[PDB]
Design a protein around this ligand. Structure first.
Ligand SMILES: [Ca+2]
Ligand SMILES: [Ca+2]
Ligand SMILES: [Ca+2]
Ligand SMILES: [Ca+2]
Ligand SMILES: [Ca+2]
Ligand SMILES: [Ca+2]
Ligand SMILES: [Ca+2]
Ligand SMILES: [Ca+2]
Ligand SMILES: [Ca+2]
Ligand SMILES: [Ca+2]
Ligand SMILES: [Ca+2]
Ligand SMILES: [Ca+2]
Lengths: 319, 319
């Protein structure tokens, strides 16, 4: 069925002076009688106002589509004096059409997203998705095109879908952990006179174990009174696998001992030495330990290639 | 019956970029099939061109109402691939609306009109009627208002109907016979930014007999050889009723004569004297005539009040 009951009013402008959108009509003959038009419905006589006899309807108000895009209305046909219906009323809509006064706009102010450290160039990161208020049905009033406006240890915003990718080969965090990129979107765009919506994106990377652990220095020295019939502990040597977290927690043990325990630890990841067997002898004054400390998992937690796991020597002297 | 098949396109402008006038429609459901719109008719695809799928029709040409105000057109509904009619075609008109680019304009360049000399203030003279090209159906695009722009031994152009009247009491031509007045007409007008059409009008008056006739001078002299056994004629005395034409033609006769005819005349309106009786005598040397000469008709042709009809004396001497 053909639709013909619709009028299109361009929104907001006219400034002052008013614009007709449609003159109505019922056909019929003359013959010494006449039709006077009366209009009723939405914002009747106030927004849209009718010149009676003719059928002329100008808008006498700024129209905002985003407020309300359609206005179901009902105008009439009666004689002037008779007022008897010279045509039973019709229902019909008036539409706007939306002009690009409405901006591109992001839902949250800043955004924060994470991505696995060293991973092949172009790895998915997140979608940023703005929003234009306008008409997504006609023209380029809304069609948006995203772009990385800045963020140059590099990611790519894939322009159609806005999805962020990385733009960089590997990306060893130990260099830089957090990343700032500023995001755009053009109304039309591909065409200037476009609109401009920006957002902050805090990008951080995760970890991997691309680090063996460290020892403060290669040769340690300590000292001790010769029995302590309690415990006890003597010294602390440290590892620092820069690769944080679980990827940092390292395992100590000694590989010139046996009078000495060595202890965990999730304390700072040291490093402590208890005296196991008590003590007795001058027979020794000097003692020696070599100590392996290494990162962990339940399957190979060095899935790359790691060289040292820092050994190192401890010299304990007697008193 | 309600009319809804009509669209309104404002004429001539857009300059470049195009303006939609109406998106079409047939209702129906989706369900994995679709409507593609094809348009055909007047200046189809060339003046008015169709965005197929949507129903959008912008004009891609200056439109001139005065060239053609309406365009009967026929657009369609078929599927894209199927091309089978998803709706039997509709006939509908597109209308313009006319904007005031068209000027007020008079049919002939100059105009020439006549009116009876002394006649009560405000006597009808003629209609001047211009012509605006525009729309006489909507707004003040055409409603015209005439004015005497100049012509100040005065006439009035009655502004609604343009009819010229005299603006002056009596108006004795003998003062001035022809009159120049320049005529105007404003498009809208009563409202500036109106349009401006001017015309020349040569006004002349007719006559009445508001003049007695004249004699060159009050005393005439002539002379004559004493017999002429032929005719003959002697002298000519003149009248000049300034009131021209029939109102000037005057009647001579003598009211010390009898040897002398006096003759008409539509010669210059004199004035001639024939000798009736021949001649004989020294017995007279000096002769005398008094002469009435007067304007004419078959009922009172001095329907005002006229004093002299200039008498006057002629002295003929003998030789
Ligand atoms: Ca708006
Ligand atoms: Ca808008
Ligand atoms: Ca917009
Ligand atoms: Ca790492
Ligand atoms: Ca590590
Ligand atoms: Ca790392
Ligand atoms: Ca025109
Ligand atoms: Ca025009
Ligand atoms: Ca005009
Ligand atoms: Ca006269
Ligand atoms: Ca006269
Ligand atoms: Ca006269």
């Amino acid at each position: 069925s053909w639709v013909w009951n619709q009028m299109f009013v361009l929104e907001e402008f006219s400034g002052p002076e008013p614009i007709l959108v449609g003159r109505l009509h019922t056909d019929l003959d003359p013959g010494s009688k006449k039709i006077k038009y009366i209009l009723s419905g939405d914002g009747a006589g106030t927004i849209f106002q009718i010149n009676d006899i003719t059928g002329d309807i100008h808008a006498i108000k700024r129209l905002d589509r985003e407020e309300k895009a359609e206005y179901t209305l009902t105008a009439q046909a009666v004689d002037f004096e008779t007022n008897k219906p010279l045509e039973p009323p019709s229902e019909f809509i008036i539409k706007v059409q939306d002009i690009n006064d409405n901006a591109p706009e992001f839902l949250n102010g800043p955004y924060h997203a994470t991505v696995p450290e060293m991973s092949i160039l172009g790895t998915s990161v997140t979608n940023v998705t703005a929003t234009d208020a306008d008409d997504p049905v006609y023209g380029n009033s809304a069609k948006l095109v995203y772009s990385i406006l800045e963020g140059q240890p590099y990611f790519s915003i894939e322009p159609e879908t806005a999805i962020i990718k990385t733009a960089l080969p590997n990306m060893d965090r130990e260099a830089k952990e957090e990343y700032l990129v500023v995001i755009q979107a053009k109304d039309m765009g591909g065409h200037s006179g476009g609109l401009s919506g920006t957002t902050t994106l805090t990008v951080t990377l995760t970890d991997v174990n691309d680090n063996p652990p460290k020892f403060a220095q290669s040769l340690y020295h300590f000292s001790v009174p010769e029995d302590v019939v309690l415990g006890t502990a003597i010294g602390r040597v440290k590892a620092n696998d820069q690769d944080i977290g679980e990827n940092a927690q390292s395992s100590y043990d000694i590989i010139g001992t046996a009078l000495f325990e060595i202890t965990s630890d999730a304390q700072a990841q040291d490093g402590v030495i208890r005296l196991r067997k008590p003590l007795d002898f001058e027979t020794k004054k000097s003692y020696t330990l070599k100590v392996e400390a290494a990162n962990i998992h339940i399957d190979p937690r060095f899935s790359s290639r790691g060289p040292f796991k820092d050994t190192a020597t401890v010299k304990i002297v007697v008193e």
